[PDB]
Design a protein around this ligand. Structure first.
Ligand SMILES: Nc1ncnc2c1ncn2[C@@H]1O[C@H](COP(=O)(O)OP(=O)(O)OP(O)(O)=S)[C@@H](O)[C@H]1O
Ligand SMILES: Nc1ncnc2c1ncn2[C@@H]1O[C@H](COP(=O)(O)OP(=O)(O)OP(O)(O)=S)[C@@H](O)[C@H]1O
Lengths: 722, 110
């Protein structure tokens, strides 16, 4: 429960001793007022304080002062616990740091009046890693403790002999690096960070969790995914939250040595990591360090990977050391590294979602003052396929666009009055280069099932065949049969077959890996299917989308070799792990008859012509600023039954709204000529779009797809298709 | 299995019809002894690449007829699969109307 962990109030006083939570909170835990408890904080920071808790204050609010929240590295409204340490004493040597931002203006001796009358005969708790601003000599003076020998939960008294240090030096880079990472500084990847915490739960605070499991789950964790997604930031978060001795080495840094000196400091890093009983050692750029053994063209690379492969399993059960590696690409690594003995936890970071990008912008706009005008949500849902460094660059470019429209002077004229607008963010978003685009994305989309008309019985049966094994495991572990994995879609070439799988992924609430047609051919010529199915099994549960299987069958062997490898990896899928596969096709004459056989993609679903109310949900999305189509004859266009060839009634809707845009721009033209544009559309442009209406598919092809109703007759010759 | 896929991949004169020849080269690598036994399953005899059917190499050919109607008895008694048997029904009614009477997928009816 941790009942002492409650929120932080503002300053009622100044010094670290004079903080108050509640005298009942000194009464249930029975901690005395005089004892130096340890108020917890981020980056393992606990501070020594003779806490004067008062019952007249709010019992959930510690009265932490203005310079105390920087010392515990916590904010207002953060949970703080307490740890007693009665082992305090004073030594002759001490080290304090004045800072020229505060103390400069008054001089004298270094234990003079500027700290006397509040630490007269003090024996008050100072702490190494604590900086408190105390006003003295009509001037505010900060006091950072940098060195203390005798049990650093320590005591100093300026009426005794002080080892006073008088160098005023700025540490503003250290001030910005005082926190420098945190769990609050990581957003959008909470499941991955929770998994990382579950993996590193054993070296910190529970080393004796080996009678539960003797595996001590394996030394070696891989972080892979896109580049620039803050894998080093994740490593620093583990580094400063675990509190273990962190011994990271950069890969190019240990590659930059001469011949024979690559083992130098590489063996020494492991020999340094062997000493401390909590110890994590980290390596970056594994692809530069250890490539595939075919690409190891030089002898020094083979020497380096042999030295690493010796040093990994040659050291074992000593101070429970854990290695961790960050890479940008998983299959370029040497396959001898990733196995069951070493380097097994291939967790992936991945690009963030819209909620993830929103959280990244929320934690990036914390240390920046916006103009309080944007929503910070428009940029979130109109950025797609963005890495976190791209979002940092987008915020930087928006701030630079805000800067660029100001007069150049050195005073604080835009320092205090900084203002970033939505138009600056649109300008930064326009001049952006997101290199996470075209990557095989994983997401749960927002295609909102009511938008998809479809057919009711088809939607109901796909709801059965997808969700009802999944969301009812009691009707899937005790009653049922073998699940029919896979479903194929065919019909008219555009009639509502793409978004049905999207809606399935929406109201099944699963991941949706989609590839559309020639992406397989492009990624094969430019293996890849193995990585696709590895990502599909790693992001389980998921629904695969084989959109336009008809398009790759017109490549005809002339690169038909990939579809049998598709069916090779699809037949290498077990019935469990909750993966799902969907095939989509238009012209079923080249259907490649190994598809439809049982054990494979087998569920035939025929998509017919849509219903009369398919036009209604088109007006839900809206993007050209005038009020929507309303109070017109929606169903009477369906009564005329024109345009009644599958989908693509959105062509009629877009044509009518483009006529509306032409009407609006002509109203703007006459308004600009002469010096309420009738925003809502009337029926006339709908009538004119009805005049410029074409059928998308022929009635002969309707007869052809009617003849393809019993298209399950396979493994027979074509017979010329009379 | 899926020898008809290898048979159907002969178009594109990426042919890979010589992989069948590699298989038959490894087939006479097998002696008549060592007690290994090779089984070929196919669905289409016209494109069978008839160098395979040279005698002494897959010499016996078995034509599988239309299947027996009594698959529905043993498709559920011998495979429960977390659901009990179809109690108190007429199983002869299915073969009386001869539903799905060309090949399998009586298990798909189940
Ligand atoms: N999960 C995240 N939370 C917060 N900021 C992030 C996150 N991911 C990326 N960023 C930002 O993106 C920047 C990318 O910096 P790096 O940590 O160097 O990325 P990286 O993934 O380590 O790149 P490499 O491949 O290791 S050189 C960070 O400095 C952050 O500003
Ligand atoms: N019954 C329907 N009700 C509403 N909108 C529909 C309906 N059928 C199709 N649409 C819309 O028609 C448009 C095209 O449908 P799609 O299935 O995406 O065509 P598609 O040709 O299969 O797309 P591909 O395969 O990616 S080229 C989408 O905007 C759908 O929302």
């Amino acid at each position: 429960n941790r009942p002492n962990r409650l929120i932080v109030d503002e300053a009622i006083n100044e010094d670290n001793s004079v903080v108050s939570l509640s005298q009942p909170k000194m009464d249930e835990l029975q901690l005395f007022r005089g004892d130096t408890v340890l108020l917890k904080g981020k980056k393992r920071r606990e501070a020594v304080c003779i806490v004067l808790s008062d019952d007249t204050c709010s019992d959930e609010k510690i009265r932490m002062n203005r310079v105390v929240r920087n010392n515990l590295r916590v904010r207002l409204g953060d949970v703080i616990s307490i740890q007693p340490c009665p082992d305090v004493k004073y030594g002759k040597r001490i080290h304090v740091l004045p800072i020229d931002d505060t103390v400069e203006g008054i001089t004298g001796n270094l234990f003079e009046v500027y700290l006397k009358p509040y630490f007269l005969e003090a024996y008050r708790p100072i702490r190494k890693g604590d900086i408190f601003l105390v006003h003295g000599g009509m001037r505010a003076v900060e006091f950072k403790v940098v060195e203390t020998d005798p049990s650093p939960y320590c005591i100093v008294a300026p009426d005794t002999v002080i080892h006073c240090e008088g160098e005023p030096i700025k540490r503003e880079d250290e001030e910005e690096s005082l926190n420098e990472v945190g769990y609050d500084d990581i957003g959008g990847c909470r499941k991955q960070l929770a998994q990382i915490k579950e993996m590193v739960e054993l070296p910190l605070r529970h080393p004796a969790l080996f009678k539960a499991i003797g595996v001590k789950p394996p030394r070696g964790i891989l972080l892979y995914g896109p580049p620039g997604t803050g894998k080093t930031l994740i490593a620093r978060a583990v580094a400063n939250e675990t509190g273990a001795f962190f011994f990271l080495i950069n890969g190019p840094e240990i590659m930059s040595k001469l011949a024979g000196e690559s083992e130098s400091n590489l063996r020494k890093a492991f020999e340094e990591a062997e000493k401390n009983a909590p110890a994590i050692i980290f390596i970056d750029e594994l692809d530069a360090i250890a490539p595939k053994r075919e690409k190891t063209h030089g002898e020094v690379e083979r020497r380096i990977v042999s030295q690493l492969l010796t040093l990994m399993d040659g050291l074992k059960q000593r101070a429970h050391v854990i290695v961790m590696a960050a890479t940008n690409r998983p299959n370029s690594i040497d396959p001898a590294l990733r196995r069951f003995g070493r380097f097994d936890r291939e967790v992936d970071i991945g690009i963030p979602d819209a909620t993830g990008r929103l959280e990244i912008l929320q934690i990036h706009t914390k240390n920046m003052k916006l103009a309080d005008d944007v929503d910070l949500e428009q940029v979130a849902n109109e950025t797609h396929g963005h890495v976190g460094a791209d979002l940092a660059a987008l915020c930087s470019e928006a701030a630079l666009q805000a800067i660029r429209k100001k007069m150049d002077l050195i005073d604080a004229e835009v320092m205090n009055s900084l203002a970033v607008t939505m138009d600056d963010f649109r300008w930064a978003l326009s001049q952006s280069n997101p290199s996470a685009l075209r990557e095989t994305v994983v997401e749960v989309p927002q295609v909102t099932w009511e938008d998809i008309g479809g057919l009711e019985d088809v939607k109901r049966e796909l709801q059965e065949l997808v969700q009802y094994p999944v969301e009812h495991p009691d009707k899937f572990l005790k009653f049922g049969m073998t699940p029919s994995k896979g479903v194929l879609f065919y019909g008219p070439p555009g009639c509502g077959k793409t978004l049905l799988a999207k809606a399935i992924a929406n109201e099944c609430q699963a991941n949706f890996i989609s590839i559309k047609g020639p992406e397989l051919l492009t990624m094969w010529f430019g293996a890849n299917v193995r990585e696709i199915f590895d990502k599909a099994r790693q992001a389980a549960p998921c629904v695969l989308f084989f959109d336009e299987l008809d398009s790759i069958a017109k490549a005809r062997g002339a690169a038909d070799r990939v579809i049998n490898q598709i069916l090779t990896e699809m037949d290498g899928m077990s019935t469990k792990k909750n993966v799902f596969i969907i095939g989509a096709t238009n012209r079923p004459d080249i259907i490649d008859p190994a598809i439809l056989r049982p054990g494979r993609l087998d569920q035939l679903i025929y998509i017919p012509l849509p219903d009369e109310k398919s036009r209604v949900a088109i007006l839900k999305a809206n993007l050209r600023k005038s009020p929507v189509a309303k109070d017109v004859d929606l169903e009477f266009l369906a009564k005329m039954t024109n345009g009644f060839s599958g989908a693509d009634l959105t062509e009629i809707c877009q044509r009518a709204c483009k006529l509306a845009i032409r009407e609006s721009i002509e109203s703007e033209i006459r308004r600009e000529r002469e010096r309420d544009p009738v925003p809502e559309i009337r029926r006339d442009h709908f009538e004119e779009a009805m005049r410029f209406a074409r059928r998308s598919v022929s009635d002969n092809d309707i007869r052809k797809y009617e003849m393809f109703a019993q298209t399950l007759q396979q493994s027979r010759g074509f017979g010329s298709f009379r | 299995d899926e020898l008809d896929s290898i048979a159907k991949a002969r178009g594109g004169n990426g042919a890979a019809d010589r992989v069948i020849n590699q298989i038959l080269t490894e087939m006479d690598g097998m002696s008549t002894k060592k007690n290994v036994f090779i089984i070929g399953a196919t669905n289409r005899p016209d494109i069978i690449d008839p160098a395979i059917l040279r005698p002494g190499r897959l010499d016996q050919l078995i034509y599988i007829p239309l299947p027996d109607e009594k698959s529905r008895v043993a498709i559920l008694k011998a495979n429960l699969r977390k659901s009990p048997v179809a109690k108190d029904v007429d199983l002869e009614f299915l073969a009386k109307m001869t539903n799905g009477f060309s090949g399998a997928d009586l298990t798909e009816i189940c």
